[PDB]
Amino acid sequence: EKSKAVPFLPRPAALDGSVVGDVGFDPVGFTSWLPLSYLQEAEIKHCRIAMLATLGWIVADFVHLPGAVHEVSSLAAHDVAVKSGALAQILIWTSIAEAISVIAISQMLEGSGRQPGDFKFDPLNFAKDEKSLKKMQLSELKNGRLAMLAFSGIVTQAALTGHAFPYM
Amino acid sequence: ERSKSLPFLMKPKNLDGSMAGDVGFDPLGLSEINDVGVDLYWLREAELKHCRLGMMAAAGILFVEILGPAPGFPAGKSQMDVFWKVYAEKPSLIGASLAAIAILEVISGVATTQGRQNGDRAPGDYNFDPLGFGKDPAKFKDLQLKEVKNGRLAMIAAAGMILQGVSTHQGALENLS
Numbered sequence: 001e002k003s004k005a006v007p008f009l010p011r012p013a014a015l016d017g018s019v020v021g022d023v024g025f026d027p028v029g030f031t032s033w034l035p036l037s038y039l040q041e042a043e044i045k046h047c048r049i050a051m052l053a054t055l056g057w058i059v060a061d062f063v064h065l066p067g068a069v070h071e072v073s074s075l076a077a078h079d080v081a082v083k084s085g086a087l088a089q090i091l092i093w094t095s096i097a098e099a100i101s102v103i104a105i106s107q108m109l110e111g112s113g114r115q116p117g118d119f120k121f122d123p124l125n126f127a128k129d130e131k132s133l134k135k136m137q138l139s140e141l142k143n144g145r146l147a148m149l150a151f152s153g154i155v156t157q158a159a160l161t162g163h164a165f166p167y168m
Numbered sequence: 169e170r171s172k173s174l175p176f177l178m179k180p181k182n183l184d185g186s187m188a189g190d191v192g193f194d195p196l197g198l199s200e201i202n203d204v205g206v207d208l209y210w211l212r213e214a215e216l217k218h219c220r221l222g223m224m225a226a227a228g229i230l231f232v233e234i235l236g237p238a239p240g241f242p243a244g245k246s247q248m249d250v251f252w253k254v255y256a257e258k259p260s261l262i263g264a265s266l267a268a269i270a271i272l273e274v275i276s277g278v279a280t281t282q283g284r285q286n287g288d289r290a291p292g293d294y295n296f297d298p299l300g301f302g303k304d305p306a307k308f309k310d311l312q313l314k315e316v317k318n319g320r321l322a323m324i325a326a327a328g329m330i331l332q333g334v335s336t337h338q339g340a341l342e343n344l345s
């Protein structure tokens with residue numbers, strides 16, 4: 001009762017405390033008719049994709065790969081990269097990763113034990129015990145949400161005003 | 169048995185004494201509506217939202233007309249017509265404000281319906297007391313009465329300002345003198 005985020009709204013009844021980044025924020029009750037693991041996986045995937053996208057947009061408006069095709073702004077880079085076939089390679093490998101993801105999310109939903117977003121990818125450690133893993137999961141979630149909102153703002157401002165890296 | 173405000177009318181059944189500003193002024197018996205998701209809880213929440221919105225709007229009109237606009241913002245003293253001048257030059261501000269108000273209003277409606285269902289939240293309550301001006305009781309009732317009276321007065325005032333600006337196309341205090 002009385003979820004932490006919205007103090008005047010009831011607790012979403014599906015997010016008690018046992019999830020990283022769980023401040024009880026679900027006013028429209030998306031968790032009431034969708035699996036929690038599915039939504040967590042979708043959120044983490046969005047976080048990672050948008051973090052990579054924000055970093056790439058900002059960097060590519062500064063540094064360009066050698067070649068005349070890579071001499072466009074990130075706003076206009078989509079139509080150039082799709083014509084050159086640059087985005088085709090990313091599409092192919094992302095589709096391979098996403099088919100393996102289809103298998104992984106199916107197994108997670110039907111038992112297994114794989115945590116949402118846990119691909120066990122960890123060449124370095126950066127997370128030795130449970131406490132470090134929880135703290136870094138919270139950091140990843142917060143940074144990913146911030147980067148999703150940041151990429152949203154960057155794209156909207158760049159489309160509104162065709163400016164360089166300062167999209168004001 | 170008779171309403172305090174209207175002695176020629178019987179006391180409205182649903183308005184005993186609880187809500188701040190209750191004087192029994194329900195001649196049409198609207199407090200007894202229990203249909204289309206509308207009841208005393210919904211009516212009180214709507215009244216409080218109207219009170220707060222009217223207070224904010226009246227304060228904004230008076231502030232802008234007396235102390236002038238903020239730097240970088242248009243002038244004209246007609247608040248119903250300066251809106252189109254702001255939108256003509258800063259449409260993004262208006263759009264962002266509208267989107268924020270839309271999200272907050274969706275949250276407000278969800279909260280109203282939930283609090284009506286599992287009764288734990290008083291109508292118009294959003295737990296918004298950052299400065300702790302209404303922590304203790306015996307002052308909360310007085311603050312509720314003050315808010316309700318000021319909000320009704322500002323509702324009437326803001327409706328008047330809207331109509332005056334739409335019709336006369338002049339400022340509020342311009343109409344005053």
Ligand code: CLA
Nearest residue numbers: 052053055056059060063064065070077081086093094097
């Ligand atoms: C969402 C991810 C994403 C997407 C869709 C793109 C898309 C694009 N980038 Mg880009 N970029 C990204 C992230 C991304 N970038 C990141 C994170 C960086 C920082 C290193 C850059 C740095 C960058 C530069 C410097 C340039 C581009 C350019 C371009 C355009 C054409 C060439 C190209 O594909 O990039 C080539 C990308 C690189 C050389 C660096 C990519 C490094 C990756 C993203 C990090 C490692 C992630 C890993 C491989 C994930 C594995 C995927 C899995 C399925 C196997 C194209 C529109 C070029 C352009 O035309 O600019 C307008 C260009 O000059 N990008």
Ligand SMILES: C/C(C=C=C1C(C)(C)C[C@H](O)C[C@@]1(C)O)=C/C=C/C(C)=C/C=C/C=C(C)/C=C/C=C(/C=C/[C@@]12O[C@]1(C)C[C@@H](O)CC2(C)C)CO
Nearest residue numbers: 247248249251252273274276277278279280281282330334
């Ligand atoms: C279904 C729903 C929402 C909901 C729900 C949920 C989501 C299901 C959740 C719950 O469970 C139930 C329920 C029902 O709550 C309904 C949504 C509400 C609506 C339909 C929104 C309406 C808002 C309209 C407003 C507030 C417009 C005001 C216009 C003004 C104009 C201003 C002007 O300046 C302009 C522009 C020109 C100037 O010249 C002069 C004037 C004219 C003054 C003043 O502001």
Ligand SMILES: CC(/C=C/C=C(C)/C=C/[C@@]12O[C@]1(C)C[C@@H](O)CC2(C)C)=C\C=C\C=C(C)\C=C\C=C(C)\C=C\[C@@]12O[C@]1(C)C[C@@H](O)CC2(C)C
Nearest residue numbers: 141142143145146149160259260261262263264265267268
């Ligand atoms: C800034 C913003 C969001 C900021 C979010 C932040 C900081 C989030 C922080 C967190 O996530 C972290 C970091 C960690 C989480 O655990 C906790 C929180 C705290 C939640 C959203 C802006 C959101 C801004 C929005 C939605 C603006 C919308 C504007 C619109 C629609 C206007 C459109 C128009 O103006 C045009 C474009 C042209 C005109 O011609 C037509 C019209 C329509 C007038």
